[PDB]
Structure 1
């Protein structure tokens, strides 16, 4: 409507407010934002994707996110997709990616948490869930999000990639699988170590645009971009970030209650009777989010300085509400329990 079009004026900006978009699109923010993004980048035209087919696919995908899960619902997918859309346009990456690579990253972002049950991989492993048995304890959720997303493409009434070439579909699938598997937090430290090595050997044109030799380097940047998007809540305005924190803590605490009910050990940051919300965000920023974004900022300097400055301000706010490599691994364990 009127308010929706006003909010969508910020489609290409980090300050877009996805909560507002959700409110004005009958709780279909993913459908909404993906249609706005694809139209903005001319992807429907480029890849001969019919609008009806695209909407049907996106609505079905959206409906496969659980509305009763506090954080990992379709609003988080919409946020990651829109954040990825903004990251693909950072000046340091101008003309670096093919249309297929752009399509793959945004698609990956959209499907990356589909059918998430609101409990972690480790909870699924420890309770001997059907999903963990299916996936042999390895990136259980992420393998599942991919399987759902790709399973939905089988059916003409939903095959948005019908008009890509066979080679194109194969390359896209390879790329998307790579990106979604990279959202598994248990791989955070390795992704970061690999991204630091990339910053070290960074090469540019005389214009300040990154030079990426072949597929290996391109997919490495894209994996990290989606991971950054997934870890982007603390880099947004404080008003937005605080809502994301309320949501993750509601989801985590519900997992902790489930753990308590079943007599399992309570994961510390999922224990509502002990965990400090504020300290947890400070630690999340210090040992996970800032190290990653500091490295991303190095890769694309100076394009991400504003984000780094917002990150610092947000950290100081959470710290004010409280009355290195070793702790990097510690916080990765607290989240994953791996």
Structure 2
């Protein structure tokens, strides 16, 4: 059993200091995808420790070690929605904690729930979207299509299935009320990763940013958690151009594979999932403009120290404009051949 040996070391070796992971590990400039995948479960532990969640919530170490490994094992390997995505999304949550003073805004348990949700938020993704589940009449659509957010409901349900696995319930010593709270938070935060949900609450997010965050307003806590979750989920776009480029490759590999399947089903894919129609620079500019930039502008409005995140996203969008000409074939292809006609 690979997991068992991995568990043994994770549990008995000690939790590595977060600075020992990387000297800039707690910086917005750090790219968590740089971390070797073999090191990420230990890094999860290091972040949990550094945020003092292990001590504060008296988390049983053997349970926590099993839990983190089970979460890791609960991701498949599509090009984008794999464990390294969830790891990088969790890392950003950690960055938010280390850089933005979330304790002035959120309860301890809410911040804890946010991190755990980040770990779990894409569990068992198959690299297809919600519409595909319905179109392909998948088991997940049979379960959840009547409620919407099919994949996100599945991710949440997988998170709970891991909790309910013997030896993996990191919350099983919580009071009944705290346990109920935690799972309720996990539901809300994971469902909030449906970008359809984000677009639906965006005006409320705007209004909250307009009037000003009210720590006494329970709906403000819920809205902020949604915004932070989305911010973690899209946080690849806040890194350097190179990350942005690689992430685009991964996302479109995944999209186009879905598109191939939709064509094999007799359905016409979304333009952005059709490898014969998708024009990636324009698609990425649209995504940055209509989705990512507004999110990090909201985040900046709420947290002035997040300004650099927004400006980096704006920058990456500018870079798509500048490299777009390169998608037009000038001269001959590099093989000197017009055979592709």
Cα distance in 2, alignment partners of residues 277 and 5 from structure 1: 37
| Pairing 1:110–2:110 present | no
What's the RMSD between the two structures over aligned residues? Answer: 1.8
Describe how 1:1-338 pairs up with structure 2 within 5 A.
7-23=21-37, 25=39, 29=40, 31-67=41-77, 69-91=78-100, 93-137=102-146, 138-202=148-212, 211-300=214-303, 302-323=304-325
Cα distance in 1, alignment partners of residues 173 and 254 from structure 2: 39
Report deviation, 1:94: 4.2
Cα distance in 2, alignment partners of residues 306 and 320 from structure 1: 21
Which structure's relative contact order is higher, taking Cα pairs within 8 Å and 6+ residues apart?
Answer: 1
Cα distance in 1, alignment partners of residues 71 and 256 from structure 2: 26
Q: Which has the larger radius of gyration?
A: 2
Structure 1 unaligned residues grouped into runs of 5+: 204-210, 324-338
Cα distance in 2, alignment partners of residues 65 and 130 from structure 1: 18
For the structure 1 residues 241 and 33, does the alpha-carbon distance in structure 2 shift closer, same or farther, using more than 3 Å as the test?
A: farther
Contact 2:106 2:215 (C-alpha < 8 Å) held by counterparts? no
Contact 1:237 1:310 (C-alpha < 8 Å) held by counterparts? yes
> Deviations 1:192-240 (Å, cap 9, x if unpaired)?
111101011105xxxxxxx411432212211110011112222211122
Report deviation, 1:19: 2.1
Contact 2:76 2:82 (C-alpha < 8 Å) held by counterparts? yes
Cα distance in 1, alignment partners of residues 313 and 187 from structure 2: 29
Structure 2 unaligned residues grouped into runs of 5+: 1-15, 326-341
With the length of structure 1 as denominator, give the TM-score of the two structures.
0.86
SS at match of 1:88: helix
Report deviation, 1:24: 5.1
Report deviation, 1:159: 0.9
SS at match of 1:321: helix
Matched positions, count: 308
Report deviation, 1:88: 3.0
Cα distance in 2, alignment partners of residues 159 and 23 from structure 1: 24
